[PDB]
Amino acid sequence: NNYDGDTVTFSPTGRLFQVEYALEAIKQGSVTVGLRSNTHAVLVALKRNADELSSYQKKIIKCDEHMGLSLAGLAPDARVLSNYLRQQCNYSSLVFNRKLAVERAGHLLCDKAQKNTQSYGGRPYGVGLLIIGYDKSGAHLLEFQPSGNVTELYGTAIGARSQGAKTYLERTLDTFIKIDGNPDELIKAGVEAISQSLRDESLTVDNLSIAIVGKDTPFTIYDGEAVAKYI
Amino acid sequence: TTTLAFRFQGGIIVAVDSRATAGNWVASQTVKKVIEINPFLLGTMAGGAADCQFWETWLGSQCRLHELREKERISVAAASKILSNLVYQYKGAGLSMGTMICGYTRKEGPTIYYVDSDGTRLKGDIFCVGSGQTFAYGVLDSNYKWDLSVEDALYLGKRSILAAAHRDAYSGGSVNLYHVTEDGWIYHGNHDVGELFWKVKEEEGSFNNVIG
């Protein structure tokens, strides 16, 4: 239709087609799962390889010891958004010695992403991010979308076929939020959830990437040999 | 500081002291006063340590970009011109530099370009730079010959730096020698003045006024 090609045009029904197609951009990407307990937050990602001879894309970006994120959709937009988040957290640390609260980071990314959806010439970010962190208020998990919407969550999954993972997370919500004093079972529940989104493929030491942050855990990414114990 | 570089039949001999001073306090006696731009190009820093070190390290990166783009080494004239233009554009800003750009190129032969804070750039066969330059000249001009042997040229540079180290308060430390050959530069080592002086007095019999 004639309203699709520009970000600054409402449809006759009031829809922003150019942003909903950015959402389709995440729907193109592979699944990444996130979940939290009161003390630990976990990310689980199914990486992709262009060819049998090719290595996999790193889908987890570490901000620092208390925060990090994963990707779904256009990786370069993830680079841009992640470096902006790094700039904001670094500025907070230099100017206040203050750990940038995860909700503050989420809303900063919301504000930055909203700008592209209102001014002409800009393109909506075709990437959605799951952000986890641990601060003075406990473990956090956020869902970021191109439209700018940012949502705090117990758990979620974004990417292709993530609906099954989200269904499993909704079913087991009352369980994994109770997990206390140990990260192992939380990561196990995360890998069980992500396994719901696999077709003609299975979790393997090369596909899977796991990350975690919490009270006793600075942000660490497990991959390769380290993730073998969870697959 | 004392630094000297003179062309001769075997290439170029570059000699420098090591002392660095801040007022009367001798800050250090092991300052490397030769910046190694590339295996065939050699900078000789004097005056302000920070300015020379930083800007000749940057000149190294410019040289690297030059080989990467044009597949041939930056000429001594070109590198000295870049440095001269840069130092000129900061004239009056407080740069303190005295630099001899010594190098060897197939289409230039052995070449020395003197560059300093005030923007000058001089091609020449013999140069002495630093607070002790006059004392080094007194020996070089009285002993220099084009057809000196490599050993004799090295000894002449060592002795010329030794004279300035003896007579100049700001020019002691140790003598570092470089020989810029047809196929590159050769670092002929470090000589401590506290031993070179006595060795030279014994062998030459000079410094007869010095007790010992």
Binding site: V95, R104, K136 | -
Partner: protein, 230 residues
């Protein structure tokens, strides 16, 4: 600002076993003219922080406005701002120090010396000094202006090292502070009889005793002095 016109003289502070005590006189002097006597130079920024400022009074009011804006902007989109993720003394001091150093670097300095005193959420006392040049330091006792020379020895006699803080109770520290005010009033020509005192305690919060008087002055020995020499 290149020169201070109206100034507040001195601020002193010390940390005791459970918190920090800080005091400052209410006089802003226009040169040698004791012009304004109602100035308040202790700036509460919460139940856990109070900021003492010296030097140019106009720059002090600017800094107070900056602190008010900090408090205002911290509460934006911060549902927890009133109990956690609230502004600690450390955050206030770090922001102030960054601003002061930046102003210094631009050759447009705030002619103030600032003591940020408070207690962190973990209960640890916070007490740091920052001046126009951006120079910062911490100590069991801090003072500004003539306090750094007159008052600071008196406070150090009470808490000379970090080991003495738990030994120092509220009453001992308050007596030391009041005696330092009396001495500064005696010997500082820019000082005033009226001063404000603020106590931040990890248990009982911020107490802010305003318009206190210097008392127990000793003058009766002056009747025996008979001029220079004879």
């Amino acid at each position: 600002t290149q020169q201070p016109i109206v100034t507040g003289t001195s601020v002193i502070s010390m940390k005791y076993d459970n918190g920090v005590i800080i005091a400052a006189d209410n006089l802003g002097s226009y040169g040698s003219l004791l012009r304004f006597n109602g100035v308040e130079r202790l700036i509460p920024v919460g139940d856990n922080t109070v900021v003492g400022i010296s030097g140019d009074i106009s720059d002090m009011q600017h800094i107070e406005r900056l602190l008010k804006d900090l408090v205002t902007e911290n509460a934006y989109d911060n549902p927890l701002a009133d109990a956690e993720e609230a502004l600690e003394p450390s955050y206030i001091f770090e922001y102030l120090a960054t601003v002061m150093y930046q102003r210094r670097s631009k050759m447009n300095p705030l002619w103030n010396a600032i003591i940020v005193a408070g207690v962190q959420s973990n209960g640890d006392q916070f007490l740091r000094y920052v001046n126009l040049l951006g120079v910062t330091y911490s100590s069991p006792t801090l003072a500004t202006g003539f306090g750094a020379h007159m008052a600071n020895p008196l406070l150090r006699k009470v808490v000379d090292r970090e080991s003495d803080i738990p030994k120092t109770t509220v009453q001992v520290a308050e007596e030391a502070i009041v005696n330092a005010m009396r001495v500064l009033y005696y010997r500082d020509a820019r000082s005033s009889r009226n001063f404000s005192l603020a106590i931040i305690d990890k248990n009982t919060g911020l107490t802010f005793k305003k318009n206190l008087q210097v008392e127990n002055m000793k003058w009766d020995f002056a009747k025996d002095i008979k001029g220079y020499g004879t």
